[PDB]
Amino acid sequence: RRSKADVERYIASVQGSTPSPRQKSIKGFYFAKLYYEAKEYDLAKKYICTYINVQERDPKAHRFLGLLYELEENTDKAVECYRRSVELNPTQKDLVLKIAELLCKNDVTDGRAKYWVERAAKLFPGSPAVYKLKEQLLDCEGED
Structure with a gap:
């Protein structure tokens, strides 16, 4: 049972410790899997895309x-x-x-x-x- 709030808390932790654009993006596979655990599929897609952008x-x-x-x-x-x-x-x-x-x-x-x-x-x-x-x-198949 993972909630949206649970995932947001992790995202906030990343933002507080490794705040650069790439640093946030490079955590995007983790964010995507956690949103998937939490049934936020659109957000999972959003975050895996941020990761693919920096780890293509x-x-x-x-x-x-x-x-x-x-x-x-x-x-x-x-x-x-x-x-x-x-x-x-x-x-x-x-x-x-x-x-x-x-x-x-x-x-x-x-x-x-x-x-x-x-x-x-x-x-x-x-x-x-x-x-x-x-x-x-x-x-x-069609016939000759």
């Missing part, structure tokens, strides 16, 4: 922003964030499957779903999770 190559921060968008069923923004996270740390094979799953769940008509299913198939050979997506794509 941190793959965990884009992934967390992607998680926030995914929870809102904002497919395009979630995919954008997960794609950036993968680019920064491509050991996250899981995010390739996640992107394929999100696109297939949302809409299989702009063509991105096929692209990501193929990449996921390569990273997870024989995966039934991937085969389910390939079946869905085959079902919606």
